[PDB]
């Protein structure tokens, strides 16, 4: 029943500092153990950043010790990271974790990670485009439809579908930078007898821009 979850801004401009919070629950951060910041950079290269003990002792990765500061707030049972002078190299998914203080040095509970991007690039809402078969394309046993979410920044995007049938297999394709801006897509497959009968629409939520569009898919 011990749980950690991190949170903070997903976009940060170069040269500014990055602040994240981890929120611990099910366990006091004062009782025992060490509490850690780690991050995973592109190419899956996993790097430890620091900890703060239950006793308030603090330790940093030498590579980062010029620019890093871990603090805690035992009232709210929280600990915090601050990384100054961020460049784009500092783009990674950041992770809080609990460990042995000493002995085996094992991380026994982790947050789910939070992705942070360092760019001066402006936040942008997506364009959402429906993907329906070309009218000549007479089909068979079932039908695939999709959304195209294009020209947005930063990541991430949630795409969710509604139709009628819980026999709907979805796929979500990871986003890619198309000249400065991102683009992603998603497919759904449905029995060919449920469409165009039963309406099908997708929902594309972009928090950084705080936006949601819903496209219906027409024949």
């Amino acid at each position: 029943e011990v749980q950690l979850q991190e949170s903070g801004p997903g976009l940060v401009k170069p040269s500014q500092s990055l602040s994240l919070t981890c929120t611990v629950t099910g366990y006091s951060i004062t009782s025992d153990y060490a509490w850690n910041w780690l991050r995973q950079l592109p190419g899956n290269k996993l790097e430890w950043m620091g900890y703060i003990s239950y006793s308030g002792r603090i330790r940093y990765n030498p590579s980062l010790k010029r620019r890093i500061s871990i603090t805690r707030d035992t009232s709210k049972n929280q600990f915090f990271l601050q990384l100054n002078s961020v460049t784009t190299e500092d783009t990674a998914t950041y992770y809080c974790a609990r460990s042995d203080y000493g002995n085996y040095g094992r991380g026994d509970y982790w947050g789910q990670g939070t992705s942070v991007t360092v760019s001066s690039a402006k936040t942008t809402p997506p364009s959402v485009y429906p993907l329906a078969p070309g009218c000549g394309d007479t089909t068979g046993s079932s039908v695939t439809s999709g959304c195209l979410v294009k020209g947005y920044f930063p990541e991430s995007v949630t795409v969710t579908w509604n139709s009628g049938s819980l026999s709907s297999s979805v796929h979500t394709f990871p986003a890619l930078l198309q000249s400065g801006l991102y683009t992603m897509s998603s497919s759904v497959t449905v029995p060919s007898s449920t469409w165009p009968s039963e309406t099908v629409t997708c929902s594309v939520a972009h928090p950084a821009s705080s936006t949601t569009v819903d496209k219906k898919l027409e024949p």
Binding site: G105, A132, K150, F173, S185, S187
Partner: protein
């Protein structure tokens, strides 16, 4: 910094198999090795600590061995749920340092992709752009080639492909390919093709459409 090295980063095996992932340290680390499993969604879990001890919860089919600089994780009776990347961590000196990871793919019966092509939407075309899209769904193995042919002529430039992780339920992969060009480029050519070449088939799987229809 103790440097950790997992010389293999890709691994593929059948359900029920036994698989070893190996880990090597720049210097003696005296059995303080930990093993972590990261799922494609990025959740992270400790498997084994201090070379061989099982973290509370972790299936016994997980085990570890090693001394000095050389260590190994062993997953046996391999499971659909075991699709993840496996990381070794040295816990002897600060900073703690991790390996590069080993991705584990579960094997699966060969599977031909279900392919679909889609023309630009009405809306995008108003916006002055035009993107033709192609799904190639549920295939194995992951290895696959896609060609775009515009009026028969191959197109390399401006194609964006995107693969999914191996499906955690049926052990397949999927991919989207997107050809983007201007509305004017689009409107200056009649037929758009999407050719898939894949192990499962000696000749390509070709889907396309014609604007003149």
């Amino acid at each position: 910094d103790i440097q950790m090295t997992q010389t293999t980063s890709s691994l593929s095996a059948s359900l029920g198999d036994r698989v070893t992932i190996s880990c090597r340290a720049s210097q003696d680390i005296s059995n303080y090795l930990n093993w972590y499993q990261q799922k494609p969604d990025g959740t992270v879990k400790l498997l084994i600590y201090y070379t061989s001890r099982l973290h509370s919860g972790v299936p016994s089919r997980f085990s570890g061995s090693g001394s000095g600089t050389d260590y190994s994780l062993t997953i046996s009776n391999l499971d659909q749920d075991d699709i993840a990347t496996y990381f070794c961590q040295q816990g002897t000196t600060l900073p703690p340092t991790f390996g590069g990871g080993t991705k584990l793919e579960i094997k699966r019966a060969d599977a031909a992709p279900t392919v679909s092509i889609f023309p630009p939407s009405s809306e995008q075309l108003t916006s002055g752009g035009a993107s033709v899209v192609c799904f190639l769904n549920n295939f194995y193995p992951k290895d696959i080639n896609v060609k775009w042919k515009i009026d028969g002529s191959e197109r390399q430039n401006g194609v964006l492909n995107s693969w999914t992780d191996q499906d955690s339920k049926d052990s397949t992969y999927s991919m989207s390919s997107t050809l983007t060009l201007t509305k004017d480029e689009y409107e200056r050519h009649n037929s758009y093709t999407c050719e898939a070449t894949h192990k499962t088939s000696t000749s390509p799987i070709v889907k396309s459409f014609n604007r003149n229809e």
